[model samples]
Target: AIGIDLGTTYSCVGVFQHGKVEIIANDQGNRTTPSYVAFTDTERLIGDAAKNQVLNPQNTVFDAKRLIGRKFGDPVVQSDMKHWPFQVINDKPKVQVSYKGETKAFYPEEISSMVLTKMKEIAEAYLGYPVTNAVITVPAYFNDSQRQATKDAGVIAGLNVLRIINEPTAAAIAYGLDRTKGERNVLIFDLGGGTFDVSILTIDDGIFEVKATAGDTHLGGEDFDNRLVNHFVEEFKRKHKKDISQNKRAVRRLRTACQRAKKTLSSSTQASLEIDSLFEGIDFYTSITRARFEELCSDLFRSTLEPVEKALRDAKLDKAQIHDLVLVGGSTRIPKVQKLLQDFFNGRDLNKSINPDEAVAYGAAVQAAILM
Candidate 1:
């Protein structure tokens, strides 16, 4: 059996063998696969190859996790669709892009199925078997429709999904806390590439229950990356008297540079953002301080708090009651996010021992092992 974490930004695959769990890397030997798909003449591509062609927005589809299995009329889908460069059909909230000489529409589940298919391929290649049974993880707050859609995606990818567990529960299982001890109140703060979820869990002995969960389906590290891109767009206009926004390649290159700067700022106090020949061969360039990045995204960062408060209120617990604050997801590596979380928890240090990017997959693997 295989365990899969079909994450918003990156997906990971793992399995249980010989009393332990091992993560399976993709064909490129990468631990996590970028959740992206691209369509071209005579072929469909996923993962790194798809991401490479992302600049051609009309052929590439990304951030599909947020749209998959959602209602077309939903407010979240309405808002998220506006940010993408590709066409998003309002009739069914599916992605519509011009691929292979004509327009094609894809349900979010279909795109997700492609991603899952790649993961399945990776797992099979590593384990040297035709693995069909598997466990998958999703956000704890996913509604019935969303969860069903996820299961459908697994089925489409040619796998029999044995379970669809909560991402936070999977993270906890990966952390391996005391199974026989006094009650422990835990907080799982998961900020992925395109979503944020805060979960309140209580564990007493071997029993664990989720008290509350809340999140924004359209928020995450990608938003932070966009914030920087917007700033650069305006900066380019000011410096070169031209808007590079019209150039998809220029904007995509800027997005990539800004993402690197965002990650760099997590460690360094400042980072440089530079794109050669961004527009008209002008070579846009600028330097951003960590303070400025935080300033620009302060509202986005603070927006996460509303859900935190909602989770705490729903659980009927106070911040002081949280015995452990577990951080999960790639976005949690940001220093500003960490500081915001620290302040929210009244200066208490977070439980950052687990690898944020791999914790969910690790936990899913543990679940798969036990179930098998």
Candidate 2:
């Protein structure tokens, strides 16, 4: 009935209607929704409802990317858990979160289940069926541990996951939807909010197979936000007399503002962020130039290129052999990112025909139909 692109920065749902991919829109008519959750003393909210409360700085679980399939004692898990925007309770056997004056036990699998459940409800509304089977998609190079975590999440969501298709393979399927048969090589550049994945796939005889795949799982848009956050923190302390940089509420507001600014910089050379009640109830306003933002995120983008080089080398194919380039994921909206990819991929005008934000989710839904 419906398929989901479960992402750390955003989530989307789509379904097949008469053999065509159609995205599921929210009440406000948005296709892709923010993948965030907040548990308050009174209620649990997801998507836009939860995204808006990001300024609250407590009770929100926004980075499900890092926690999925990780052990409690993992070095990274322990190092980043308490220092995050949420309050971490260390006494539990499982990782626990406290915020918004509420306490809840959390696992990455459960968090993913919530998003998947919502996607199922939306898909059922679109398809008018009690569909239970799914063909989910994941990074092509996801190791056994990560793949198992995804299946575990599907299980918790009450799904019979038929397969976990590679992210590149899924995008290639979307790209080749109209092609009845072909023998062509395709490059899928998938840059998401929390992970970067580049995959090379070949399509022929109605078969899509991964030839090569590579990328960093933990490096993505969230890291970009952190880069900006740290910058603003230093600037704030230098400008104001007091150090409000340590304030979680202040940091949360800045994090949202910085992310918005980063998105805007993809189109505009300059962006401004204005916030109220920050720095001890003083409104803070700052203007950021595109050059400045790019400089800050250059290292972030560089991380994605490593796998590009690897994918190219691993495939043993030059840029000329790839027939087409396709962009998938929300982070591709960055202008510098697009430019870098365009130059590196032998001038193939990576098809922007499909909405970068909605394509993957639509493919996911198509996958469900295929499973049926």
Candidate 3:
């Protein structure tokens, strides 16, 4: 048995052996694999290989997690489609792609299965054996349809999914809260690439129970990237008196650059964006300060707290009762987001001991071990 964290932007796999859980790195030597798939003229690609071919955006399917089990007319899906270079058609939100000299359409479940199959291969290569059963994790706020879709993906990948656990619950298990002596109240703040989730749980003597969970499926690091992209678009228009939003390739290039800058801003005080022949053979260059980046997405940062408040309220607990506030997800590394969370808890220190990117997978591995 193995454990898999099928995330919105990235996926991770782990295995428990010799009384230890090990995260399996892919053939590319990366622990977390991008949840992307691409179809070209002759073959298909997944993970890093797929993401590298950004020029063929029309055939690249990324962020399928957001579209899974959702209808095309859904307001959230409709709004997100504007930013994507690929086409989504019909009520099922079937993604259109060109493969092998013909046009084809795939449900989000099929796209996710490709990523999961890659994950299975990574684990099999590391453990030197066939993996048949596994446990997977999802957001606590995911509805029944979304959860079913994930399990269906796993089945399509040729594995028997043993259990579908909530991501934050898995994180808590990874923290070993279940082995504690007494009752402990835990709060998990998970802000990932495409979704935000806050969950409250109580643990006592190997028993774990979730009290409440809240989140916005459409909020996360991607939204922050969109804000930065929009700002740069307006700036380009102001300087060049030309609009490039209609140009798919140009917009894709700019989006990629902005995402890199956003990641850089996490550690540096300022980040620069430069592109040669960005639009109409014009070179574009700009820089953003950490303060400015925070200001540009101030509303987004603030909105994250709404779920935190709602979770606390739903759990009927006061701020001080939260014995442990754990941070999970790549976006939690942002300085301003961390500061806001600290302020909300009256300056209490957050639990950062666990690796934000791998905790959920580790926990799932532990659960698999127990089940075995």
Candidate 4:
């Protein structure tokens, strides 16, 4: 059995074997594969290959998790489509893409299935055997329709999805909270690339129970990237007197650069954004300080704590009652986000024992082992 974290922007796979869980890396030597798929005249590309060749935005599908099990008329879907380059039809928000000299539409589930198939291949290549059973993780607040869509995706990928576990719950398991004696209350703050979820749980012995969960489906690291992109676009317009926001390719490039800058800010106090032939064949160069980046995303960052407060309230627990504040997902690496969480819990230490990027998949693998 294998475990998969089918995330909104990235996916990871793991297997529990030889007394430990091993995170399987793809052929590209990446532990986490971007949840992207690109279709061309000759062939289809998945993961890093697809992301690298994203010039044809109309044929590239990314962030399909946001559209899965959602209606075309949904306010969130309507707002999200503005940033996406691909066309979305009214067939429950099906994505239209050009492939094999013809235009075809695909449901979000199908797009997710392609990524899952890639994860399955990665695991098989690493384990040197066929893997049929898997346990997948999703957001704790995901509704029934979304959960069912994920299960259908796994089936389409030719894997038996033994269970669909909550991502925060899986993180808790990976943190070994279930092995601790007595009762412990844990708050999981999961801020990923495209979504956020905060969950409160109670673990007694080996039994784990979720008390409450809350999150913003439309918020995450991507939002922070968008803020930086907008700031740069305005800066370019002011400096060069050109509004390049209308250029899809340029915006995509800017978004990617902003994402990298965000990552850099996680470790450095400043990051430089430089791009050649960014727009109108002109090179774009700029610099952003960590303080400026945080200021730009201050509102968004503050919103993340709302769900944490809501989860605590729903669980009927005070801040001091939380035995551990576990951080999960890549977005949690932000220094400001970490500081905000630390302060929110009255300066209590956060549990950083598990790898934020792979903990969910690791825990899912443990669950798979138990089922086996």
**For this target, which candidate reaches the highest lDDT against the unseen true structure?**
4
Tens digits of per-residue lDDT for model 1, 228-276? 9999899888877999899888888899899999999989999998778
Q: lDDT for every model?
A: 0.87, 0.76, 0.90, 0.91
Q: In model 1, how large is the Cα lDDT of residue 26? A: 88
Model 3 error, position 224 (Å): 1.5
Return the lDDT, model 1, position 113. Answer: 92
Question: Of models 1 and 2, which has the larger lDDT?
Answer: 1
Tens digits of per-residue lDDT for model 2, 1-372: 466777767888777778689988775677777767777776777777888877456667776656676666768678767656875544322335564564677777777777777666666776667757776666776667767787778778888887777767767667654365667778888888777888888778767777888887677777887888888887887888667767878887898899899888878999898988777887889888988888988888777777888998898878888887889877788888888898887566986667787777767777777777
lDDT of 3 by residue, 175-264 (tens): 887787889999999998888889999988777778889988778898999999999999999999999999988898899999999999
| TM-score of candidate 1 on Cα atoms, chains taken together | 0.89
In terms of lDDT, which candidate is stronger, 3 or 4?
4
Clash totals in order? 0, 1, 0, 0
Candidates' RMSD to native: 2.7, 3.7, 2.9, 2.5
Which candidate number has the best TM-score?
Answer: 4
The better-scoring model by lDDT among 1 and 3 is 3
Better of 2 and 3 by TM-score: 3
| Candidate 1 structure lDDT | 0.87
**Model 2 TM-score on a 0 to 1 scale:** 0.83
TM-score of each: 0.89, 0.83, 0.87, 0.90
